[PDB]
Design a protein around this ligand. Structure first.
Ligand code: FE2
Ligand code: FE2
Ligand code: FE2
Ligand code: FE2
Lengths: 246, 249, 247, 246
């Protein structure tokens, strides 16, 4: 369970780094199972018994429950290997626009979060379990826009419209910031946060596993391009992201 | 077929909207006829998958234009059913923005399936319902739709304290200061934000109460399915409801 | 102090009628004090009379007001109101009504912008109406209000004014406009974000009441102000769209 | 002189805004010189025509109007001179508690802000005009708790009850950041933000002027201890601040 200083930090920043959650032994168990699984590794829980158990470990479920406060369902669980020269352009943000064909909307209810009577209510959160140190920007560090999880104005739509071609992750931004982590730390993430990763320059592999959680009525995570015509299309339609003009 | 400023004001401030005379007499009759084809007090589950008639109605623009104006998300059809009500049927109160749920280790007072917001000129309601009325309902004994005023934006819970004080009567049978009724004509559509606390009066008159209902929400909501509590393996999908009158009446 | 059911009702409807807070004895006592001071408005009652100065601090008023403001408190206004036949009060208030502010148009009035947090309501401006006579039909000039309008997100009145209307909704009617009936010595606790008014009084006699407004200690005492002054030194409350603006 | 979309984003997401080089070095010498004619310098406009003009200068009013969006009133205007070993402990914060006699409240309406149809509505903002350079924490830099202008949990009360003695501007806090400014820069501040300054360890005076603005129905700024028995007390009652227990 999260302390009050942790809930406070989560609420105000949109994420929480929890240091030293998993032992060196466990991390190596996790690392081994990833190397055997040979870019992204979809559905880790169906492919391993150790990842099916990780997805329900109390070291992940207890902080998750404290920020979702709904009946839970496991929405996704993947592995991630990043090599030299990989990058993750910004996505998320609370007020980014989306065109529907007859209107543009400014809310994505899959990430719209609230607070009520001592409890945070976030619909979609991730637990990033790092399996390798990342201690400098060139290691491909997590980066985020400060406060962007409670943002009221869109940011990217005007960038794209004025013909930008450079991701903030490369060029910088007054409120872009990095997070540095050690093996077996967990990064608890509010998906409303606008975030990405620095371009990795270093040699070696960066590895992590990620589990996404939500209310029991959210469909399992899968990308959808748009509402289908028979209104039967399920999935998550993305709003403005840097990959749409960078 | 879109909603006026005044219609949006009313949906926003009351949690619902009667759109009158949407379907003509002929359509209403073909609808009832189709229900008669599918055949006391009884239910017609999953209408869109059992009838091409009702599969068309689900995607009719007279239902979709209003819905799109209050959901404003990539849309999905979550549910669709038929209802035939006779004498001595009642629907007790359910819904309400702030009703409590015991999760086991805690107590929560939000339900994110009905938690709605507003931003830059648009309403964002994640679960709305289109009721298509195939019968006139013109008095409370006909089993009229009833609701608690403003309950779609209530910050306090109502039902827990009544359950605890040992009440066993529904406000539907008993009355409440801000409990109001809604009267409709057949062919009227009632647009409904599911955050509203609502039910219907006990029906004591003769004849058949007939309606169809369709639920819409975002494409990342699952098709409607009742779920008692979170499944033991966090795989189960569905909707866990909060305090409803059925729980202690 | 308000009950959970009373807090629920106030939060969900924007007001609360608390029945029979003052007995017939106090009521006539209050009524007589209004005479001694002789639509007519009796401004600054607490300065004009020790009786109303006492009323304004009466725990029967302050306990329910504290339950809806929940700030360090300040008396912001106190007046009396005498109404007679053919008097009417058109709609004012409304959470999202517009105000033209020189170079922009705004749709929030922070003097009535209210919130909820951790079990408590926080309304910055509430009125306690003490009724000194019964009102049991619309033609008596009953309190009327637009349901849910204290938490409205769209403006109502501007569309009407631009569409060129000139009849008030208290006369013409409106789908969600309702009336409230009260008895002598009732208190009506009102959230000023609520859009309200009164029906036109067609009956004979006098409709008497006293109103005390309350707010945080950093609100100025109530005063109308046409607009921001050029030296930024003018204090007071600038009205958003009201029906009197075009009826 | 109105705020760009990016400046509005930053102010919304962080709770403040540094506006660089608003006043030239001639103007800044004019202000420093005037402050020599007259440590806190209370009510500057009433005391000096130069600062009466500055209080209504459009380089301040234009951005202020963009984040308040109400009929505007000037609520305070003071000057500030700090020397060595001066410090300013944390205060502000969206959810800091206040004991009200028979109850405990967690909103302060004088700084409770909102957003509606494209506009920010912040009832109390300060415009800080810096007359000297602050480029290191030991000059006594402005500091703030990130995202605390939208915080939903209290932070200080629990610290106070645990019995903490030292301030966060001394020990540090994981989300406490610093802001460096140059002479002639304007800091535009949402007062819901929890903020203060580092202890000044250098010589030379630290000069700035501050003007505070709100809606016309706000009383001019004065400190008030509690609501008075006659409910006639006007002014601003502060919630938990660090000075209460440090
Ligand atoms: Fe991501
Ligand atoms: Fe229902
Ligand atoms: Fe009024
Ligand atoms: Fe300050």
């Amino acid at each position: 369970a999260l302390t009050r200083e942790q809930l406070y930090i989560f609420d105000t920043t949109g994420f929480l780094v929890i240091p030293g959650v998993f032992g060196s032994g466990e991390v190596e168990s996790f690392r081994s199972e990833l190397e055997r699984l040979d870019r992204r590794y979809p559905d880790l829980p169906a492919a391993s018994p150790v990842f099916a158990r990780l997805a329900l470990d109390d070291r992940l479920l207890a902080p998750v429950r404290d920020v979702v406060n709904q009946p839970l369902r496991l929405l996704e669980g993947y592995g991630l290997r990043r090599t030299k020269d990989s990058v993750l352009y910004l996505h998320g943000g609370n007020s980014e626009l989306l065109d529907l064909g007859d209107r543009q909307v400014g809310r994505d209810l899959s990430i719209t979060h609230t607070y009520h009577d001592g409890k945070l209510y976030c619909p979609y959160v991730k637990a990033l379990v790092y399996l390798s140190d990342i201690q400098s920007p060139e290691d491909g560090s997590f980066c985020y826009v400060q406060g962007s999880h409670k943002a009221n104005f869109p940011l990217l739509r005007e960038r794209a419209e004025r013909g930008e071609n450079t991701s903030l992750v490369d060029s910088g931004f007054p409120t872009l910031s990095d997070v540095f982590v050690r093996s077996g730390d967990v990064l608890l993430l509010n998906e409303a946060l606008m975030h990405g990763t620095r371009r990795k320059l270093t040699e070696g592999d960066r590895l992590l596993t990620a589990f996404g959680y939500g209310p029991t009525f959210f469909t399992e995570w899968r990308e959808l391009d748009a509402e289908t015509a028979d209104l039967r299309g399920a999935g998550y339609v993305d709003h403005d992201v840097e990959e749409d003009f960078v």
